Design a protein around this nucleic acid. Structure first.
Ligand SMILES: [Mg+2]
Lengths: 337, 336
DNA sequence: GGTGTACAAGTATGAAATGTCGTTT
DNA sequence: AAACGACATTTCATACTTGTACACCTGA
DNA sequence: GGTGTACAAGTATGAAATGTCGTTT
DNA sequence: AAACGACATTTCATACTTGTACACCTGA
DNA sequence: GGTGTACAAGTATGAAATGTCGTTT
DNA sequence: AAACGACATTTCATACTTGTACACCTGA
C-alpha cells in the first residue's frame, strides 16, 4: 500500500537512480500494484524534477471568492469600535459566525470598557486641564509633594460579598453567592496622610454624618496629631475634594485662620486624588470578600492594614501626582487610561 | 535529497522489490548520498516488515513522569469548586502555569457564579418549602392560574448606561462609558397583570413613594380597571410581603372583595411572576435607553406592553408550577 | 493601586530510534 | 557478505519552569 | 424570562493535480 | 517505446452558511 | 440621598407716616 | 378753627426663619 505523497517520494529516488521516468513507473506499478498513479504523472513529476524541484507541498487550489474585503470589515470597527457580530453580519451581508471568524483571523479580541467617574463637560475638562497644567508647572520648579498632605472619605460596608468564579466541566453550574444588602451596617471612615505615612483617621459610627462643623472639629484633632506626629511641620499643603462640606464658608475660614496651602483639585477628579485612586484603591482589593461582625472589628482591621503597609507605599501614591497630572493634561482634561 | 520519513518510504519500495537490505542500502547511497541511514537501520526496518508493521508514524518515547496525578487536582475542585490557580498550584507543589494547563487538558473551564437575592436563614428556607409545597398541592387539585392576578413594583431610571464591549487588537483601550449617577431622575412603575395580559399600572411620578394609604387607593383603582376589562371575575392576588402589603389596613381593603391572598415567602422574588418573568424581560429591553421626559417613559411602557404577544403573559403565569416543583425539591435554597 | 491566566521560551525525562562494533553465520 | 547482539548516542513529544503579556479589578 | 459567540456540519468555489488519448519522435 | 501537446476529470483547502451549545444577562 | 451656599419668596418684628385726643388761645 | 404734645392705629422699610436650585460626592 502506497499513498499520494510518499508515492512521488519514490520517483525522486528513481530520478537519482537514473531509471527513466516511464522506466520508474514500470517498477512503481509492479513494485506495489497497478493501483497507483499514471505514467503521465511520472513524466510530469520528472519534468518537474529535471528543473531542480521537490514537492514542498501541493500548491494552493481554487477557492471561493472573499464575500467581503478584510479591512472592509475593519472600517466598521474604525467607526464603532464596539458593535456585535450580528451587527456586522448585517452591515456586511453575511452570517455572524462568519464574522466570528474573520475577527479571529485578525488580532481582534473583545475587551470590556472602563467605567469612568463622570460625563465631564467642556468647562469641567477645561478646569482639570489647567489645574494639573499648573500643579505640574510647579512640580518642575521644585518638589512639594515632600510637604503635601491629603485625605478623603469613603465608606466601608460591613459585608463585601464577592461574586465567585469557578472551574468546571461545561454546562456545570458555578458557585452562587448571595447579593449584598443595599441598606446594611456600614461605617464611613475618613482619613488623612502624606508621603511618609498615614497621619490621623476617624471612623464614623454606623450611619454617622459629616457636617461643616463636624469637618472642622476633625481638621483640628488632625492638627494636634499632625504637629506631634510630624516634626518638620512645626507650610503644609492640604489637598481635599471640593465637597460641599470642604467648600464650607466656615472651614474655608477655619483653614485660612489655620494657615495651610489649600492645594487646588478640580471637580470630579478622584483620579487626581491620591487618597482616592491609590489609597482607597489598595484597600478596595484586600477590603474584599471580607465581612465585618462589629464596628470595632473594622477599626481593628483598619489598624492592622494601615500599619503593615511599608512606608514606601504611601511615598509612591503621593509621588504619582506628577505623572497623573502629566496625563490629566496630555489627555486634554478628559479622564485617562 | 531524502529525509527520515521519505527514507523509511524508500525501504518500503525496495522491500516490495524483493531487494535485500544490504542491497537496498547500496542503492540508497548511490541514490542520494552517503548522508543516508545506517545499513543496520535498514535491516531493523526490514524485520518490521516481515511482520508487515508498515510504520505509519513513529512511536511515543521518553517522557517525564506526571508530577501530580490527574484526578488528584480534580479532587481539589470537588472540595472548593473555585480556587485560583495560584492556589491549587501551591497545594500540589507545582508552578501555576503548570496548573493552567492540566486544567486546560481536562475539559475544565471557569465561569462566574450566579448572584442571588439573600442568604436564607435555616428557618427562612423552611418557610418557602411549605409555602410552595402547599401551592403545589393546591395546584394538583385545581388549576387556579386561569384566575391568578399578580403584580409587584420596580424602578425605572431615565438613563441606563451599560459598560460597552469593543473589539480590538490585544492591548488596546476599549470604548469606555461614564458611570450612572446613582442618585438621579428615576420613576417607579407599579403594575399588576394576569395570565391573559396586563390589567392596570400606575407609574408613580419622580421621587414618588408608597404608603398603606396609597396602595389601598391603588388596589382599588385596580379593581375598577380589572372589572371593566376582565369579564369573568373568584380572584387570586399574588403580591410580595412588603410592609405596605402586610398592613392590617389593606389586609382589610382586600378582604372586602373576597380577593384571595395567595401565600408567599419572604425573600422570594423568584416566585414573583411579576418579577422573575415580567420585569425580567423588560430589563434587557430597557438597556442603554434614555428618557428625557417622565411621560416619555409612560409612553414606552404602553408601546411595550402592547408589543408583547398575548401568549407571553400566559407563559409567565404558567411557569409557576415548575417553579415551585423546583422551589421545593431544592428545599428553599433558591435554584441555580 | 493588585490579581489571575495563558502564551513564550527555556530545562530535564527517558524510551524509542539510530549508531557503532565486535561477534556469530 | 549479510545479518546479529550489545551497548553508546542521538532524537524528541512530555511535564514543568521561569518570563512575560495583558485583560481587569479598585478608588471614585 | 434574552442575546451574543463559537464549536460543528454541510456545501457550493475553482484552479492545481491528475486522467485519458490521439499525436510526435 | 518514451514523452509530449490537448481536452476531460478529480481533488482539497476555502469561504460561507445553517444548526446547535452554552456562558451570562435580567429579574432581585 | 447627604450637605452647603446664593437667591427667590413667603413671614415675624421694629421703625416712619398717620390718626385720635385733650388742652389753650 | 389752629396748633401742639401725648399715646393709639395703620403702613411699610427691613431683619428672620422657609422654601427651591444647582453643586459636588458618590455609585448602598
Ligand atoms: Mg418588590
Amino acid at each position: 500500500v502506497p499513498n499520494k505523497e510518499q508515492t512521488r517520494t519514490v520517483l525522486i529516488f528513481c530520478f537519482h537512480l537514473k531509471k527513466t521516468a516511464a522506466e520508474s513507473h514500470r517498477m512503481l506499478v509492479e513494485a506495489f500494484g497497478e493501483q497507483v498513479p499514471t505514467v503521465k504523472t511520472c513524466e510530469r513529476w520528472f519534468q518537474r524534477f529535471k528543473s531542480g524541484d521537490f514537492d514542498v507541498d501541493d500548491k494552493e487550489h481554487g477557492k471561493p471568492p472573499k464575500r467581503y474585503e478584510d479591512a472592509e470589515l475593519q472600517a466598521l470597527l474604525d467607526e464603532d469600535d464596539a458593535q456585535t457580530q450580528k451587527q456586522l453580519a448585517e452591515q456586511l451581508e453575511v452570517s455572524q459566525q462568519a464574522v466570528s471568524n474573520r475577527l479571529r483571523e485578525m488580532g481582534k479580541i473583545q475587551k470590556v470598557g472602563r467605567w469612568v467617574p463622570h460625563e465631564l463637560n467642556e468647562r469641567q475638562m477645561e478646569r482639570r486641564k489647567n489645574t494639573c497644567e499648573i500643579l505640574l508647572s510647579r512640580y518642575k520648579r521644585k518638589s512639594f509633594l515632600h510637604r503635601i498632605v491629603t485625605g478623603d472619605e469613603k465608606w466601608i460596608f460591613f459585608v463585601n460579598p464577592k461574586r465567585k468564579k469557578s472551574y468546571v466541566d461545561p454546562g456545570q453550574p458555578a458557585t452562587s453567592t448571595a447579593r449584598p444588602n443595599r441598606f446594611g451596617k456600614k461605617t464611613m471612615l475618613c482619613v488623612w496622610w502624606d508621603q511618609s505615612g498615614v497621619i490621623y483617621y476617624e471612623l464614623l459610627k454606623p450611619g454617622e454624618t459629616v457636617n461643616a462643623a463636624r469637618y472642622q472639629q476633625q481638621l483640628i484633632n488632625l492638627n494636634r496629631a499632625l504637629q506631634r506626629k510630624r516634626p518638620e511641620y512645626q507650610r503644609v499643603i492640604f489637598l481635599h475634594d471640593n465637597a460641599p462640606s470642604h467648600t464650607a464658608r466656615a472651614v474655608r475660614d477655619t483653614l485660612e485662620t489655620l494657615n495651610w496651602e489649600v492645594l487646588p483639585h478640580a471637580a470630579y477628579s478622584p483620579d487626581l486624588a491620591p487618597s482616592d485612586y491609590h489609597l482607597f484603591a489598595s484597600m478596595g482589593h484586600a477590603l474584599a470578600e471580607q465581612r465585618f461582625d462589629s464596628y470595632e472589628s473594622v477599626k481593628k482591621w483598619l489598624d492592622e492594614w494601615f500599619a503593615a503597609k511599608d512606608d514606601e507605599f504611601y511615598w509612591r501614591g503621593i509621588h504619582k501626582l506628577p505623572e497623573r497630572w502629566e496625563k490629566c493634561v496630555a489627555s486634554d482634561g478628559k479622564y485617562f487610561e
